[PDB]
Design a protein around this ligand. Sequence first.
Ligand code: SF4
Ligand SMILES: [Zn+2]
Ligand SMILES: [Zn+2]
Lengths: 138, 698
Amino acid sequence: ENKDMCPICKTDRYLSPDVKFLVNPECYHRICESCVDRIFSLGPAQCPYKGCDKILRKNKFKTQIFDDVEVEKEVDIRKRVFNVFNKTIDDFNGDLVEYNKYLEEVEDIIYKLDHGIDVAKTEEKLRTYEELNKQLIM
Amino acid sequence: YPEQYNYMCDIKKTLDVGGNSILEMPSGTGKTVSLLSLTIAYQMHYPEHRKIIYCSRTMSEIEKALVELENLMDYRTKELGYQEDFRGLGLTSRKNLCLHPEVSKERKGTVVDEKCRRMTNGQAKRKLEEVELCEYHENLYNIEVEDYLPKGVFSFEKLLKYCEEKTLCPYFIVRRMISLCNIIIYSYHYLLDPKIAERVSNEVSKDSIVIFDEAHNIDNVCIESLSLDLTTDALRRATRGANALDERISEVRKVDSQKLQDEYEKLVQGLXXXXXXXXXXXXXXXXXXXXXXXXXXXXXXXXXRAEHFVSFLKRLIEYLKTRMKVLHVISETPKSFLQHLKQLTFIERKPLRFCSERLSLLVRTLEVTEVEDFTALKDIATFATLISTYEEGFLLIIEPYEIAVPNPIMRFTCLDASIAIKPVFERFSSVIITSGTISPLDMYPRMLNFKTVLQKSYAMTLAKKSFLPMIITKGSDQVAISSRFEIRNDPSIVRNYGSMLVEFAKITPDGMVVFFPSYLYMESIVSMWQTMGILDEVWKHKLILVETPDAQETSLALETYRKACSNGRGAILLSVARGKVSEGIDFDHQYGRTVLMIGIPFQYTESRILKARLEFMRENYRIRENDFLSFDAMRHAAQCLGRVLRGKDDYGVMVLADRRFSRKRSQLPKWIAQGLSDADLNLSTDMAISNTKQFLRT
Ligand code: SF4
Ligand SMILES: [Zn+2]
Ligand SMILES: [Zn+2]
């Protein structure tokens, strides 16, 4: 929004907004350049975005064209899980039923990750990621 | 008459041999020919083989076809005294063929079909687990209603009054009578409609004769079948629609989630084919013409439910907002746009099958549907169906930024029109194509490729009753050049032209109709004209078609024209050839005996659409920079020429400015080129010769 983009620099529109507003993937919070640079420059600490406590790490930023945090998280987790599952048992022979069922399973896993449930099934999905990675290494 | 009899023989031989014919009929004397030729051609074979599929461009031509068809019924019932199985079904507008919106709604909008779906859903819900039925229902599917038409003609007005008396609804009568294979009189926007052409194509059951009446705007109708402008507000309606979908997800997931799982199982087991095969009398959504699409085995989001469809739909509309917020000038290739979309997020080329199914699922799970949100979802759904399929000739274009506020627009450019018309040449044969405003008739074998025969008009007699002069010298020959620019130049010269219109209107005060290439000249001469004696002496009042036309305003202007000409007053009708209402009702002195044309017609250039279709037709037929400034203008001028011709018993005069008219053809090519001041005295003599030769030639 034009009224919130940094708890210290929330209204920089009349100060020539020439600085970007980075967002950390472990906070989903907007921080302007001159602030975040000092943040990760003085040490990996949390940002004071409305009393935020999640630690902001050095670098590992991203540019955002803004498609809501829900859809951005669903497409980041969607792409990551899509790369973990890769194309195992997909176009191996040409079947349409089992392929769509496996895609339904993957999308249900991404759904359980973007919803979180109760922090119990998602851990089993992480073990599934380690198993799939072990299958891709072999 | 022998002249029309030749066209009767041509229609006969083309109906008995050819599969399609390009017949050029004279304006004003070729409407009643095919109507009887088709019926007699049906009687000579055996009474019920092929049926009349008459297609017009307006509703006035539909009403004229209905009353002339009644003249055929009376004509065949007054000469033999034997009663036969009558035909004639009037398929008109939904708002004009319904009775309930005139009792409680008191509206004539496009949302009457939604209320009709509310009543139909009320009937289905009172026949299943339980608003009222409607006004009268449950008796519209019986044999008596199926026989009220073959025993007696009840079309449109007679059907409206007959339903108001017999307490019936005409919508289900017409819909149930499309399968009866009567003489259907509908417009071109129904034969090629991505929502109506499917059901009509499934009810007529093919095997008939199609009659393209006034088939000169076929390319315009095929163009109007696509091109939807995304003007930043549809993004807000799509956002609120996505929020409404999320609320509905919370509602169906809150308490009642069993029906969504049962219908979901119906999708996993029987897919879209079973979903559309089980539902009866339920509201449908848009589709890119399924007979032309030919895509079966529609999987429901790779076997998924609704939350995934609204998630990928939110990602899709957000990607649309991302593609609509750009610099200014940018053109899209529909394949490159789909590849870029795949680079943003994988969704494959199947969101078409994902829209046609999920929309029906939401409909099957919705009982209180909001109209704006569902409409926006149908728009985004159509955009998805047309970025997933139909790519050859399709060209996505972004409107440039010109202020940059009033700007974020995205329009899709349609494909080759031959593709859209194509199915009628497999469904049918002996499709007669008649038009009185086609000259030359070679741009229809060229553009739109189809094998056919060419028959030109062979009727031309009594040239003294059809005064056809043209004006070249306007006294200074300076307004004919300044009246051809897109933006007018030298306002004083335009004021002089308007003064010439005042002198010409004063010379011939007997009903004047003026056609303009655009409303800019009208709005420039109507602001401050320095003269008004024509309105104060001979015309009493002037008739001006608003640049934003209104139905009631145009109707009051036409009735005002008929009453003004029926009181011995007359009025100038300042209209635009590119505007609404092309007219076509004449055969009387109430219409303009003299018609004035301001130069030649012009199409608005400097547009991305004209450049896209310009290069597309350049690659197709190589008719670059030559046919788009003479063929379209020739049709627009022929729309004004057709109003002057109204039978040999009547006369008229049409003045065409600009010498460039010599570069194009015209109906009845008998034209003399002279000045306007000389044309004043020439018309002054014609207004007496036309009155003297009548009783002499009779
Ligand atoms: S049944 Fe007839 S009158 Fe009633 S809503 Fe439908 S079209 Fe209108
Ligand atoms: Zn700051
Ligand atoms: Zn934070």
